[PDB]
Paper text:
The third crystal, soaked with acarbose and G1P, has no ordered electron density for either substrate in the active site. Some disordered electron density is present there, and two fragments in each monomer have been interpreted as glucose molecules in our final model, but they probably represent the average electron density of a mixture of many species, possibly including solvent water and glycerol. Correspondingly, the 422–427 loop is in the open conformation as in the native structure. Acarbose molecules were modeled, one for each monomer, in arc-shaped electron density going through a gate formed by Tyr900 and Tyr905 and adjacent to the active site. This gate is already formed, albeit unoccupied, in the native structure. The acarbose molecules have their non-reducing ends overlapping with the position of the glucoses in subsite +4 in the maltotetraose soak. Together, these two crystal structures define a path for the acceptor maltooligosaccharide from subsite +1 to subsite +7, at which point the maltooligosaccharides would extend into the solvent.
Quantitative data about starch phosphorylase protein abundance and enzyme activity are lacking and no crystal structure of a plastidic plant starch phosphorylase has been reported so far. It is known that starch phosphorylases are members of the CAZy GT35 family of glycosyltransferases and catalyze the reversible transfer of glucosyl residues from a glucose donor onto the non-reducing end of an α-glucan chain. While Pho2 is localized in the cytosolic compartment, Pho1 is a true starch phosphorylase that acts on starch in the plastids of the plant cell. We determined the crystal structures of HvPho1, the first crystal structure of a plastidic plant starch phosphorylase. A native structure of HvPho1 and two complexes with acarbose and maltotetraose were solved and refined to resolutions of 2.7 Å, 2.9 Å and 3.0 Å respectively.
Residue numbers in the entry:
A (entry chain A), B (entry chain A): 69 to 495, 553 to 968
The structure:
Amino acid sequence: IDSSAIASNIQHHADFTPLFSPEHSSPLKAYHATAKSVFDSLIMNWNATYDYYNKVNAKQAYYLSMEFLQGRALTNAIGNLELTGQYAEALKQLGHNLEDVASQEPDPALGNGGLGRLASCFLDSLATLNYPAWGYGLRYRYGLFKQIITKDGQEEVAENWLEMGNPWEIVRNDVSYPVKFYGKVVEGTDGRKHWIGGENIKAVAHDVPIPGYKTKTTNNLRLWSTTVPSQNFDLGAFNAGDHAKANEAHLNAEKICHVLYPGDESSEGKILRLKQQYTLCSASLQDIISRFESRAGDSLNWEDFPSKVAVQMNDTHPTLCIPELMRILMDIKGLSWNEAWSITERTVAYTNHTVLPEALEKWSLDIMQKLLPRHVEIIETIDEELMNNIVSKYGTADISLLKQKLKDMRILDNVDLPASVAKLFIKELDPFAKYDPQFPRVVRMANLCVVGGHSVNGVAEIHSEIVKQDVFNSFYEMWPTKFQNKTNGVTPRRWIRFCNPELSTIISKWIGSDDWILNTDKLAGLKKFADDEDLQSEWRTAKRNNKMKVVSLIRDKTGYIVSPDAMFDVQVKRIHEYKRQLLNILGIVYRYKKMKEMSAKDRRKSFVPRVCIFGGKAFATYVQAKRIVKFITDVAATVNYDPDIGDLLKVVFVPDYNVSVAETLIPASELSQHISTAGMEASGTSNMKFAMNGCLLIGTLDGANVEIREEVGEENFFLFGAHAPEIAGLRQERAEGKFVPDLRFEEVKEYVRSGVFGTSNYDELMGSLEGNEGYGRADYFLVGKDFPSYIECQEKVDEAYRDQKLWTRMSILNTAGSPKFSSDRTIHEYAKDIWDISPVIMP
Amino acid sequence: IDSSAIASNIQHHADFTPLFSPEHSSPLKAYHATAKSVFDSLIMNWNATYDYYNKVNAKQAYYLSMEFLQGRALTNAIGNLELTGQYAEALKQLGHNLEDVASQEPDPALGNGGLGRLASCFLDSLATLNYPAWGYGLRYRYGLFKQIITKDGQEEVAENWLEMGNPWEIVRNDVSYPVKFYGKVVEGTDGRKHWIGGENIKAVAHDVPIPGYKTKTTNNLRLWSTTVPSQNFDLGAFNAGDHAKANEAHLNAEKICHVLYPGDESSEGKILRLKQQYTLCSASLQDIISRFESRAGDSLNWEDFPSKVAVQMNDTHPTLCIPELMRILMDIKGLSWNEAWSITERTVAYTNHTVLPEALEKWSLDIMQKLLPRHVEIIETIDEELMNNIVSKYGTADISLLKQKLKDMRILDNVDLPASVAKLFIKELDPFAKYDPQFPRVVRMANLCVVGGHSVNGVAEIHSEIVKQDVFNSFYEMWPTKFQNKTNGVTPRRWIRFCNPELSTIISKWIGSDDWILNTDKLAGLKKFADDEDLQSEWRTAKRNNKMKVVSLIRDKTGYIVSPDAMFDVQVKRIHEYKRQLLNILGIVYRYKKMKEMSAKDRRKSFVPRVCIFGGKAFATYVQAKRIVKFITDVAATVNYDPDIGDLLKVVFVPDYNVSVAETLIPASELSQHISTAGMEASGTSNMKFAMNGCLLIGTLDGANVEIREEVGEENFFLFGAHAPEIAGLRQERAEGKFVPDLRFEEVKEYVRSGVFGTSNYDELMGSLEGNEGYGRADYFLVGKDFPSYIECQEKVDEAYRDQKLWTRMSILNTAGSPKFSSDRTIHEYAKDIWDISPVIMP
Ligand SMILES: C[C@H]1O[C@H](O[C@H]2[C@H](O)[C@@H](O)[C@@H](O[C@H]3[C@H](O)[C@@H](O)[C@@H](O)O[C@@H]3CO)O[C@@H]2CO)[C@H](O)[C@@H](O)[C@@H]1N[C@H]1C=C(CO)[C@@H](O)[C@H](O)[C@H]1O
Ligand SMILES: C[C@H]1O[C@H](O[C@H]2[C@H](O)[C@@H](O)[C@@H](O[C@H]3[C@H](O)[C@@H](O)[C@@H](O)O[C@@H]3CO)O[C@@H]2CO)[C@H](O)[C@@H](O)[C@@H]1N[C@H]1C=C(CO)[C@@H](O)[C@H](O)[C@H]1O
Ligand SMILES: *Cc1c(COP(=O)(O)O)cnc(C)c1O
Ligand SMILES: *Cc1c(COP(=O)(O)O)cnc(C)c1O
Ligand SMILES: OC[C@H]1O[C@H](O)[C@H](O)[C@@H](O)[C@@H]1O
Ligand SMILES: OC[C@H]1O[C@H](O)[C@H](O)[C@@H](O)[C@@H]1O
């Protein structure tokens, strides 16, 4: 397969699967054609993988998530096929430039943050390692939002990634499943339950092939798009004039796939958010059930189901899988409860990504009882069993103990106990065993996940322990063997090899192969070359060359002009008080103030030149987070155009941060910040990406930083701030008026309140770092406390950067210490210790 | 190009431009693949035709219509490419059957009745004869409606023809034009008018290639699909919960293409109906303007516009082209009024399809003034000129004369006259020259078409004369050279060659070539063979063989079982009191009654066995038309299951009549009915289709029947009923109580009122044939008057059918007399006498 033939197939797709006029000439047009030419390879390989999986009928794993941050497919598809050189030349022939063409591809708006990017990285590694595994998701039209930066801060625009269609998917019109909303349950002649009536939609399959690296294995991401058949369009309504009414039925179905994480401060938003989940679970399980059946054929035994199927619920969003699977087995296939439940408990597993026990999904029983009444019946039964198992394992004898065990583990909170358990609380019945209308009737989804899965895991050593000790303690006591750890990882193909080709050449030279891309353990061979002068020279050149593409990005996106000969200091993550963008910007503001009260000779002596880059999206409704992006932009306007500063310091907020932005930013980064309040982050995947590219980390002892620090070495990581255990106490200390801040912290607050950063003044923002008690005040995320520790830790970063021998030594040790954080070994662990699947290699 | 290669390309499209799972196996799946394989040929040819038209820059013709009844594309594409034999074999290889595959294609819901089917036939003939010509239309999603027959009569279901996408179109993403609604006009610095504000949508192009027969020429049907850019989606509205509000902007744009002829008894339906038209006109003219400019390049002279462009407004729906063209020339290109108007008058032309002067499109000025204010300004100016030209040509001297000329020709009725004309009516001003609020302010679109076009034509000799004498008399007096005739035609490739292959073989044998398909004049060589016994034998066999496919259709669609050894008597057209389905069914009911009051020996002696087939759609809101389909179905239920009748008589209502149904029905038809009240039909295209297939016509002296009768011979056409001139008098005779019906007509009415046809009784329906005066009563369409003439004319049809020598003799003379009714010569006439275009043959 040479470049001359690819050039023909690109031309062919431009003209014979066309989207534009023939005489029209666009980089974009070249993209859709090039996309389709690569896609031909994925189809061949996808069909081969599909067909051979059916033959072998091995256990298949299924990863359900509400997010898939897929990113641009072109550069990684071509890379994994190893046609990256020849496609480039094929495009020269046609008067195009691969890099330039690739940058016309829009980012699929199928995800948002870590949850989704993990999932996507997991799909790459599953394919690359020949594991039989699909992802199931939903096909979002507008996604979360396209972020634009005005002079008012952030604004939100709905995404346009499907406007011309997605070349990377295949519609499967034969694959349509019915999904039902509302309705009621009745008991038919045959003793069996039947869910009738309500509202009915159809989920249709849109497949996105996932090609593996140096393998024919091409796995799949099956994406549901909701609709209703044209016949549900009401002509009477339309011809009468009421055009919205005529379209109402279609809107109801279609809106399930409109927006990611739709705002739920309205009963109609909660119902939609809930329909999104049930749709994903139901459609996906119906499809999985169908595959099991067609493969098993005549010799069909449902006891084989969990040895042929593994479902993985990513976070609590897919919880409904549990009762839904029970629904189909009993109501549709005619299994008994115990036979169905045994299969369910062994099929399903749960991964938790939160460290806080009050960030776990809860739903009003009333809302759920209305929308999915059959599922509540089933949940009710599950909760009754759960409680009879707690009864067996503890009490009658000690009741107040039993009382505590039952609160912790119940799925339905503030509900009348079943007559069985209720007995044990008579005096008549204790207040505890009755519904109290003063509070809502709530369904706790995390608890239902733990009850329903055979395995529960966290995403970092520290976090998986918090999960056992704080979050699900009484459950761990009951079922200790459930609980596991699976530290996250990221694919080295997207996050080193293809986003950082310059570094990748350097790596393969000195290690003596490019095999590290696949077997990333062989990066450790770099430890010994850390001090070698020549390596250091190539390594600094590369970093510098990668920074020049960011100069183009900043120039292009913001308008600001920045020099690549500064430290590229990057904080890039969702805007939140707890992630503490505010801590970083206030630290920059401190250095700015010092520069201004210092002679132009001394400014150079005291501070290394920096380009401090922020990025990320603020939840639209989050007032304070949006004020924070506003504030940062204002600092940039003031700092960047100040004659006294020049190129000594620039502050930039890159808009619309996404996979494509990260791909340019990350390889160019020298310092990255991961400074969340200690014990608030569960893992963090960007941490791992940065280190792989030789970027140094400044951060707290929190999440993935803790293990990253172990692997790369404590000497090569800038640590600061309060540790997780110290936190609760520092806050209680604050509440009783005992916290007195550093004078330098009050200095900055007053210097911000001075009005130096525009007409905004921000007395309100600084007000969130003051007082001793109250929502949104009282410095809950310890910005003032960690401040002195932090700015002093930044002085150590300056002083290390002064010795580019030391800096680059540490840079190389970070790449050399990254092997542990490859999603490849994360997948192995999942495959071996949870799903119990094996790889399937086609001959 | 042999069948072995086509079989590969079909397989290729199934697997490499897929719509289904790979293991899935469907006739439907085979269709989408086969469609795409043929399409490869159309693309090649379309691009060649497109490119060569640009080189030659000849005058191009443009046919605007709100309807295109395209029909299934597969059988006609393959036919026109002459790959019809090899595609059939290519499909045998893959385990499929072309006929069976073809029948999986859905009918595009892009039209409805004659207006649209004419347009489509016109596009075939334009391509076949190498004329440079496009069609411009709109891309309807749900169309008019899918008709289903229940036991309640007709019901309407929205169509599903786009549910899996149209394989026969190409989206042209670079071709998008902005269209504006509401807004206001202001005069900018540069003396020029500027239309600002309002609502803005975009029309995107979806091209449908039109391949010609035995030519590479592939012309185009450009179809506009309305939308707005994703950014107009309101996330704030969506996240707040108001999901319809968030989607409102998209609904407004998208609904313009939802339904054909949306119900307009509501101000919101009228506004939509009006937006549909403006969108079609604006988008299309902007595109035409763009093509003229790019071709002309540097040497650009707008005086050349009408020698390089011809627009044809089909009916009054595209009238807005006139002021829209004026808008762009003056406001956008900077032409003066006279320079713009001269170009407009010579570019545009109008075809009229109505015989009634009160069936001509009128719009409220207020509604138009709100939606398109700039166009009303322009119309106002046009009407003022028009009136100053009437002033020149008539009056001041005779004023009451002038008064009459001004009523007849005004575009804006019930509006204050311009100060110029108003002068002439002082006493102060005459009531006539003032707005009278007692009546609406109306814009008469037909008059604006006549003022704005260089040519005005009817669609039949008789009708084109009515147009000159009754409808536009004062205009004919003023501009006699405007007025023309262009008798309709239908393509012989779709309506003989491809729908009736059995007859087509017979034709080519005896004429000694298949060249008649193209040069249809050579059907006249059949006159001499009309009596030859052998021809007659093959000819009757064919007709009989074609009737057996209708037996399958009836069995399949209705459930009824019918014998092909009866007379296939077909009335197939839109359900309307004026088309008089009621006259036909009451005539059948008369024969049924006679059969029942007659011995089983005599039933055979008196009547020939028949299968009487009805078809067509009733306007949903038309109460009486819907009662008529109901009544017919009830007669069928009673007649078809009556032991006394057996196979002597069957009545069938075939549901969902469309192009595909006509293609099976027409070639099987022996008698077809065209019995509209005399002088109510302008032409009729199905008339011409039937005769071409050797079907005999029973009809009134009305529309296309008059010329069909001339061509095939009066001896070979069953004529009955009152002539057009007699009508007005018969109605006035009715109003003054002088009409006394035939006793046999009162007999049937009472026999229907008897309750013999179910629990419905229909006293209401028969009530519409009674009284002397009043809306919906008084037998306005002369059913009772023409009845005796009609049933006696059916006795003559029976007696002719008895002698199958005579019947088949006349059948052959009908085919032999059809040459005049080929759309080919219709097109030549349009090309030569109106558009002034020439054919363009690529070397
Ligand atoms: C989810 C939420 O977490 C954080 O909220 C915490 C408050 O900051 C604390 O003050 C504390 O609340 C305590 C009361 O102040 C105290 O008087 C007593 O009644 O106990 C309360 C215990 O809750 O604890 C809160 C939660 O643990 C954080 O401040 C806040 O930003 C977080 N919510 C944001 C997230 C979203 C969604 O992305 C937005 O919708 C919210 O508006 C944001 O505020
Ligand atoms: C368009 C309409 O045409 C026909 O209507 C005619 C009436 O049948 C006549 O009675 C006559 O109306 C006259 C009054 O009865 C008389 O008292 C005097 O005031 O003069 C009147 C003059 O109009 O003339 C009418 C029009 O020339 C026909 O009966 C009717 O079916 C036709 N409309 C149908 C079409 C559609 C759209 O497809 C439906 O919306 C209507 O409901 C149908 O009725
Ligand atoms: C990797 C990645 C993230 C996750 O970063 P965290 O440190 O987990 O916040 C978010 N967004 C994008 C675009 C990414 O590539
Ligand atoms: C030709 C045709 C018509 C037009 O028939 P009229 O005699 O003009 O009513 C209507 N519908 C279909 C499907 C046709 O093919
Ligand atoms: O922000 C911390 C992130 O850590 C990891 O990426 C988790 O997988 C994700 O759920 C979480 O959001
Ligand atoms: O029904 C009579 C028909 O005659 C012809 O087909 C005309 O083109 C069409 O406008 C009209 O509807």
